[model samples]
Target: SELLVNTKSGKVMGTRVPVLSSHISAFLGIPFAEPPVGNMRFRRPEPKKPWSGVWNASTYPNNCQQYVDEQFPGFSGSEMWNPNREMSEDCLYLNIWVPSPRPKSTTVMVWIYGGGFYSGSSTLDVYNGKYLAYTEEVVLVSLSYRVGAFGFLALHGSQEAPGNVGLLDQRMALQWVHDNIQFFGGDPKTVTIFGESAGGASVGMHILSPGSRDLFRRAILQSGSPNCPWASVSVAEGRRRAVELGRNLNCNLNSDEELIHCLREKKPQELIDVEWNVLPFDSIFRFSFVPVIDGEFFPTSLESMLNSGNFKKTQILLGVNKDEGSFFLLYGAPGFSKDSESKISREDFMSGVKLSVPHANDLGLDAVTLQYTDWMDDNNGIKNRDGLDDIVGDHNVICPLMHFVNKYTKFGNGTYLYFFNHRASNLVWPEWMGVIHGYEIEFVFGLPLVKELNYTAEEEALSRRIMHYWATFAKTGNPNEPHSQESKWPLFTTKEQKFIDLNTEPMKVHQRLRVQMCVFWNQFLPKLLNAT
Candidate 1:
């Protein structure tokens, strides 16, 4: 059935899509900003013009111009890969799934998909909000923002080519939701923003942003943070890249006006094709064009923001998967890619560790092998290759997450931490892969059952439980009391260091999550900074 809702922009018509036994009014491809084409490219998003008649929002919108994984064969890629929607330059749309029989105002959850900052869209099947909206009785939303050079190019912060325009796109979407969600039976006051990987880092960025104050009430970050080395570009380097791009395009680099006009005149494909002078790494997380430290949006360094408590005093739930580092093995060390040896020798593992953490000296590397080793032998120290994976995980995902948790907890706010240890029953990945990057999205979105995972009863149950926890967290600050099952999700503290270990056999609340390893990192990073 077709449904209509009036908004400040105008009337919008959505279609009722079946979800389980009920139906949800799915409003897809609604423009939150004007089409960022023509001269508008590289500029901050402008509000979409008011419509005259009912806007047809039943179809999915175009994805932002991105070089997807399928576009590259031998290069690094995401396991959660696929482009679901058509690609275009004018992609600044958001989708909503409003459950039927709505209350006065339902709790709202906005999803930000992850593909570093260069690629991502709400059109991915895993991002479908049907199941969550129906089951949790909350309004679910997803939006697309600019990626790659179109989003992050910075030439001295001129109006033509300012940095962090992608973030601005997201901020505008949140504000749009705040103004219009009530018409769709969603409460503007109750909003939670959640995302994974780069999306997770974006969530943290919004929290730390002054313009985004009073926009969201809470946040959930999975396996990413603003503190991660790949999350932001230095302004100096960003401007340099912008200049390089201008030179490559045969534009006069001396005048920002000529360069901006040249870039605007060029095709989006040409813009995306520009070589990214980003820091070198084999993983997608080591992106070239990402969020930048623009003085306007990001006034100070992320560390300074955290220390000064510049963010909103809102509840936060954050965590990392147990084997997050294993995913990096695909492109990290020389011998770790696909079609390579399954068993990683200690020597090979150590070599990989050196490549990943070059900042660490021989002594620091030795300390890492010792720290992660389960049982070191005199002849062959740290026999297991997984230990090497754990080292990368700790350096990249786990340690950063724990450090972020520690900082957020000190604020004396209700901070919840989780450890995602559940491996999906359907994937054919070797056990060594562990629960590596972006694995939880399948379970969270209830994709296993739909995709024919042949899930065991326990798998299905755990999926339901996780969805419940996530949805409840969006509704209330707490994830426990709202669910039918008895789950004790405790607040994280520097003293307790508590977190829930999400598993299929029995998801348990635990305190010790690589405690010894975290303690070592907590002490080692400062020493590393001093050494460097």
Candidate 2:
């Protein structure tokens, strides 16, 4: 089969790989932008200039420079999530998988990986798009973006080092796909951007970003949103961190120009190694360098933009896991571990609440503690494990996502919500950790189809159904359309708030997910903030 494809930049050659009964042309490491090195270090990414001849698109690309910590608990097998390739500053490349015997004008699905904006790469094995593209018969693409200080360092009013260049890299890649995907037999107009965690928040930011809104027609956010407290920092906070980083490196901090000049000259590893000295109490929830409200990329705050209805009106599929906090608590909580049976005491839980919401007054803290505590239980204060989990989950992900959904549905667009409740039978984590964060990525990417993983027949079946639902949504705005025998996913609204419960046996539908908890965190907590 002819695997040569012509992109605007130049001609490229892909490798043919077999999947099931069919085959796919895998195109890897295609540069969408010029290397963000030298003068382009912290500035917005520039589109790749055309090359002379056919570029070999078979090898995986370099990952954006990041610190890879291998000591994370083995609960979810996260060791497998590390970058599979070398790291580099010149890492703005994208991968594509086009099903063989290609269909004309096929729908395209673009993926963005999540890593708290500090780390992550599309080169991970789990993110491979071969099976998804082959099974769903859609074009799949995943791109790399600059992370950490190299990507997000705002120098006050300095236009040269504007913050959110990481997001700009994503936008540049989207533009590349939109402009060049047709050569791979995909419809650029039917593009759907989807991601998890910080990647999910990136999707949300794109929805609100004027520069990125028109690049794709639909979006899927799994376990993250821009409303999440740690997803972004204010411009002032971004500037302060940048200056602090410079000071830590013994650079002249008298001016933004001097600081940026010094930073650009330092080794990338040195920049990655500098510690921000985040307080231990807040370390779990706070990130050092994240997207900022740069006037160009973000324009204003997320809430303000949402309130003004200033975002793109596209079909959205978003949801959270049942126990979103367990994965985080494993690393964040002082005394918690993966398999340890130690329980979170009342004092520990209160301290967590104080750290999570430092602005809350004594009365507000009392109200929050009362709301999350189970008064009916005999050991309410002594055994507060469940309460701690719920508190962290609701404060970080659940509440923010639900709040965003409510505001989004009010705009009268097609929105589908989901709650991932099923834990894979193969995971080593305790049963009590129920559906921790990011457990859905495997099923979503059809990893069960790989026999080496030892996934059961039932798990494979569930994975197929999820891929079908996701692909159907990509092809059309609604997931149920181009109809299949699968359970019907209802449209979410401000009133009904219907959602699908993604489980193993029967995928059921539910309404008003965590109403009271969301109310406490979203509606009541904000009121307390204002009152105090």
Candidate 3:
């Protein structure tokens, strides 16, 4: 069936797609902002102008232009995650899925995708919101923003190319949702912004950003936080990278104006094709271009902002997978690939540690190595590999998320923490990979209910539970309330430090996840940096 809704941009016609027993009105490729192309390139997003006649929103939108590694062989899990839709510079669009018999004033859940801040698309199959919307009876939304150089380039003293335009694009989308979601049977006041990885970090960024205040009532960050070392760069560093990009593209670098003008005139692919000059050592944690600490978006350091308690105080649900690093390890470190059966030797482990924490002094490195080492089986390469994975997971995903949890929970209204320990039964990767990063996305989106994946009954039940929890939280601040029979989710605090362990069957609540490791990374590591 066809459905029409009037939005700020005018009327949009959406398609009613069946989701198992129910159906949803899916409005795809709804333009939230003017296309960031031509003169609009490298600038903040402008609200989309009101259009005449009905806008067709039945098909998926164009993904923001990003480099897809064609070298990845066919049918690889990595290839599965890449953008499946056409790529374009004119891609500031959002997709919305509303239940067919939607209730009045339904809660809204907005999603942001993760690709280390350089790549991601809302059009991914795994992110399809039909199941979540139909089952949870909530409005689900996902938006596309520029990535890589097109999104994050920061030129010194160039007003035309202020950094963090990608974040700005997201904020504009939220504004659009706030203005128009009511017409689609959604409550603008009850918005929950959630994301995983870079998307998760973006949610954290929005929580910390003053510009994003009042845009969301709740947030759920899965495996990523703004405190992650690689999430943002100083303004000076961002400008330096922009200059390097200009040099690589052979653009006029005489002045910021000339450089900006030259970059503007170049083809979009030319900018993305420029070699990212990240050192091999920093490859695992750093991106060539990321959100910058621009004065407007991020006036000061994240720590300073948190310390001052100047961030949005909303209910937050955050977590990390059991083996968040295993996915990164396969692609990031040398000698480790999906096909490699060889275990990582002690030498390889040590080298990876040193490279990942290049600034750590000898004493700090020793402490880190000792902290991760399994004295019971110190000689085993497999154990060494596990240690390496722990190191990466702690430094990049786990500790940073914990840090944010600790800080944000101190003053937030309601803070819930979780640990995703359930590995999907249908993964193509090795069993040793455990519940790797992003594996929880399918379940969270209720993909198991589609019948195509053939997930076990337990998995489908778990998916239902997760969707209910997420949508319940979006509706009210509490996940367990408004009536749920599942295990009661405990609130996380500085003293109690409670979290739910999301695994197969009997889900259990746990306390203090990786306490010692978190202290080593969040406290001891910083002290080491200060002392050295």
Candidate 4:
């Protein structure tokens, strides 16, 4: 039994969940809002009423049902997202992992699993927060918000539905954390919202989305940024696509109530399987369900906020993998061909971007390619595309990300940027090419894989360091502070954007930026650069 904390709500009591019988001080799955099912499917998040009993948070909840049913075989990291087990439509739940006898005044770290807004869950075995709990003495929270149409569908005309309900759910979850985190020994004020890929992109949106303001204090983005094409788009486009998909399925929302009933009746997987890109007005730009820039939950756009420096202050530790898009390339897409290039098309990649961005020139591919090519030829004595492995691999991710940092760091927002080259020791590719996208996720969890393939000791060692960095960053705003046995890390700065390149040679790579790339990609001179 614990002492009662005085509050307006009278005697606030907490009970320990069975899973935490050994050390978990208390665990509670307090439902923050009405279940996002039936009529309120695509609407904004709502508040959950005060509970009468101490709700149990013992079991993890299943994530929303989507079309991602282990469709892709050999999905090395895919299961880390959407488990192959049976899923459901009523899957808007969050999980928390707390150390036994929860720490006093601990930073609350929330993990949002990323699956490109199409597929993912919080119950992945690898994402267990025990290591994070043990390492930093912080309460670990992971949430599985609605995905695809269930979360980000454009509900422009539906009287019953508002836009970005998934984002609204995230905000609600944060509010829940803020309101009830004290019961579990978490500091509601010191919460760090972070995730990889789409989850990372959500963090990006959270910074700009009006809905998520003041949700958390610190942030981390890994392998994704909100500035990407799908993160910010016109409501008209989203609605247009939704309507077309409706037509295709013969479901229309002329009346808001009818639309809600029509959509709710569809099978869960059916809602998720549609191609956001190939469906009518949205056919051009392929994506999973994209977050919309509705004036309510999200403002004009996250990119706009970044460009204008009109963002709420938060410590940002953002990074991109050496090959951000390589995994998709090798694995190919759902129905796409694998024999040829199992990757996004070169031209499509070029077209997907909005090139006029001022920062693009400063930290972009057009200007940096030549410098990288020159360095590659000089060092490796190779030529053309093969030698430029790092160049092509990072062009889409690192450049724009650094551009984002350039905007924030100038305002002195504790923006830390890094390049992760530490490939898993059993990397199938040549060392020259380095690590691919998401190679860092396994390491971040600090758990061993149950895969058939064996891992090297070096792989395990690198995994330890990565998890250490991630968990430390989650606990404190900055990850640079050295602990009892670790080496000191320098905070990134414009003068010296020190990146701890997880590599063996010259182990520490200094700021090797190709400034020319930024200038080259700048809109003023794109016609002259020639990629188009």
Candidate 5:
């Protein structure tokens, strides 16, 4: 469906949506960052110049350059991971799928893709918003931001590049939404930001970002691990990493003046190709560039902010799949669920976690481990039928989620938890992967551009139901009752310790959980509560 378009932002762009159904429309390749080429490499994201012509937004913008993962091998090296689109340092763009005639009554759902802070975009075929927006009477938006060194690398001794430029880019996009969404018949007041994996982590971030608090009312995090980095590491550490980058780029990192110059001088393809050499682990989250503990855009870890009662006003929905880390095991070794050793004694789990982040400490390490263990006790650490279920889920997925959940439970306006258990089929080696990572996305938002994971009628129904829950939550801050077939979900209370178990038969099992949680509750209650 095509519609006459007018916008308050500036450019007079013609809006058009492909046929599937409904009033949905799409615009592709919209710039969010000024080109990061030439002297802009490793610097803070620059604002884009407005276009005066009617730029066609029918196609998606190029995804950030990334090494191909054999699991989801993309042939396009630049555009949408394929040669179908253009790739450049100017790749900060966002896409929108808004149902037509513009539903002023509708809410907006923005998506941030998952790629471990390395690669992703609003242009990916899998994220098409036709079904999610048109069927739900909402508008959907997604955007692209800097990955690796371009966006997240902390430049030492240079005033040019700010740490967490990718995150800053995200803030800019939301600010754009706040200022411009109404032109597309979107209610800026009713915006919800949600994502899976790194994208999910990004959603969690908005809760603590002062810039974004008013931009969104609700958020969803799916299989995300949020990491906090210092604004700038010590001169030696920063210089050391820069040297490695220089090695990768075939230059000298010791030359502070030439480092940026060398990086800028590289071709886009050459730059990305250099990154390919570090594949399987060179993501911003892993190495190249990541959020800095700059104490500004990202003052501290989201986990700490939550423990400190930040995001106390945001309503949050957090969930994880049945076997989140199974891929790690299926692809590598050592249990992905952290179940093989029964404990992380073999490799100082606490110390390992700390070293992963600069300035890790015993308190933080113990808090993380205990938070998961304390919350995962099905028999409250006693003995009971299938304590393993809670244990594994807690150790890898649930407890991490609770680290997030309990934070919201204690301080946020409200909080909720869910476990994705539907395993339609296994794409990986293990059929036991359960409803492993990312199985719920297509269910929550039907993929339009590409065929989503094939689903049966029952699976399709579940997907629709989940989407309804999400859509309802974005609109009214309630996932069920407001628009779903289920009964009203009670607000979470520490006294009640309520947490909804989204299952084949999801019931009010908080009491059951409390009974199972009592043992840990008794031991850690006083100390954690006192800290609170």
Candidate 6:
């Protein structure tokens, strides 16, 4: 009964889950870096060294080279990608479970999978951390970085691939699970780092990376953020998609070290098949190879690090899905509809809110269709489908995540907002798409008591009260301090902008999450940052 362990890069072997009993363990495909391939392709992820011997870990690997989600057929990319694994460009792996009866050290979490940074992976089966480490015991992990344009590209700047090497391969797998999670017992000072949707905008670009300031400490960020309007990109549009992927590989190379040596001599399925024409072709938001602002892992602009308050002040739990754009307007108003009754007519619902608010042409087109059809008297623009799901989920994910959690609870930190609003009674969506995007990752990994998803023993007791208020806010950042008897998740002040409406009675806070269409998309996001 000794499943072997030990990991400052060696000794492996972890099995268990044949229907979970002998207290979890798992540990599949462990390789915290090295193999970004041939001169480490787009550069940056290094680590992985110590293996003198034992290294089998278990199974789940591949998936990093993206593109195939049946080549974008009607969104939700077949439940956010997982066409039976095997896809690689040497996918830097990671998986793990670890559970038992005690804890000299425990609480870890990790996660990170969200397509739309170019497809997801952490071997998606709804990101199994083995039933949240066999019922909230803790230590889960998940890893596998580098997505789209091979982990976001940006050249001729801060050296070769200065564009978030997929957030530096999630900061070298959170410094290789903070130097090997206390040799599997867990707790590298209680990490957290959760994700969802471009891995919640890569955990808000690693809480505005100061090179991910001292790895993990805390953060959740579900349903994406990094002030959403298509999570990041603009280092002159990532050096014009790295010279349109070097003139679609004819390699017009003009130094960024010879166009990164003709992008490390192509073939990773020709950079995942020219990422569908290297940028700007959104059927429903794909923000051309995202994460940019490069000058060394995003030097500034996440609205200048939450507006001069500067970054990395951890402990945040962010939220969104009460139809976070109803699984992105079922592939954005059916690709600006020519069918389905001209899809919300009125010039295709003002051209799908100017393609999900690409600055809705700086408020003009009949004043943005009279404030997204609040002008309806038969204006012929928004023929209700809940006003095209409130203008593509409050102009793309609830008013830039309620203005980045109200300028992040004014830097006093320790924020905890929530709003999921339950829906899983076996959903493949269309209960009028209420709790849309990443519906709280099947109640934060309980996945309706293991995917039969019939859910409802009060939604499996609200998935053990949302994984015990997310592993008791990753063991201490206050998700009501290990207390979920059933209510009291308050604390989000700035004159009590309180939250937590996880629904089916998690209390009905702030009259439907600050409405008036999130205050007219928070005063139309400063004219959507002055359009184009």
Model 5 lDDT, residue 104, Cα: 67
- Indicate the residue-level lDDT of 503 in model 2: 72
TM-score leaderboard ranking: 3, 2, 1, 4, 5, 6
User: Which tens-of-lDDT digit does each residue in 1-532 have in candidate 5?
Assistant: 2444455445635466654443557766666557766677667766666666666665666656554455435422123323235555677778777776667657988888776666665665557777788778888888777776677666645766656677878877887777777877788888888898778877767777776688777888887645323122333444455556667888756666766677767775665556534322311124444455555665665656766776628777767786664443333332223223222332333333333322324554455445444344422322211232343333344444555565566766666666676775423334544555666676777542223445555666666767877888888777876445555656666666565555445454453243433334333543554565
**Candidate 6 residue runs with Cα over 4 Å from true position:** 1-9, 12-30, 35-93, 98-112, 118-141, 148-240, 244-257, 261-278, 281-284, 290-348, 353-382, 385-433, 447-457, 461-532
lDDT for each of the candidates?
0.79, 0.85, 0.86, 0.61, 0.60, 0.73
| Model 5, runs deviating above 4 Å | 12-15, 18-23, 71-86, 225-240, 269-288, 300-304, 334-397, 426-429, 447-453, 483-485, 503-532
- Cα shift from native, residue 227, model 5 (Å): 5.1
Q: Report how far off residue 360 is in candidate 4 (Å).
A: 16
* lDDT tens per residue, model 4, 378-414: 3332232232334433444565566667776766557
Query: Which wins on TM-score, candidate 3 or candidate 6?
Result: 3
Tens-digit lDDT track for model 3 on 1-532? Answer: 3388887789999998988976789999999999988888999899899999999999998899897866466856778788898899999999999987755798999999998888899999899999898888899999888999889988746778999999999999999998989988899999999999999999999999888988888999999999898788888888888888898888889898889999999987888887466322365767877898877888788998888787998788889998988876776676476765637877777777886676677888888889988888877978878788888888999998988888888879999888988888888888666788998999899999978787988899889888888888888888886455657999898898999988776867788899889988998888988988
Q: For residues 202-276, could you state the per-residue lDDT of candidate 1 as single tens digits?
A: 998998889987898889999988777668877887877678777776787668888888888888777666645
TM-score to true structure, per model: 0.91, 0.95, 0.97, 0.80, 0.77, 0.35
Which ranges of candidate 2 are over 4 A from the true structure?
72-76, 278-281, 358-361, 376-383, 482-485
lDDT of 3: 0.86
1-532 per-residue lDDT for model 6 (tens digits)? 4457877788888777743344576878899888888777777788887887778777888878777755346655354555468787888888988876435588898988877787777877777888878888887998878877777787636455777788888889888899887888888988988888778878877777787867888888886787777777778877888778778877856667877788778888887777667765444565677788765666777787887867787678888877666555665564333123333555566566666655444544455557656553545433555566666766667777777777876884688888787777666545556566776787788877754546777777787778988888888888775434655787777677788788556466653365666766667555655563
Clash pairs for candidate 1 = none
Clashing pairs in 5: 23-100, 27-57, 28-57, 32-92, 76-81, 76-82, 153-289, 229-293, 230-293, 231-293
The per-residue C-alpha lDDT of model 4 at residue 480 equals: 54
**TM-score between candidate 4 and the true structure:** 0.80
Q: Rank the candidates by lDDT, best first.
A: 3, 2, 1, 6, 4, 5
Model 4 clash pairs are: 23-100, 24-100, 361-518, 361-519, 361-522, 362-518, 363-518, 367-516, 367-517, 368-517
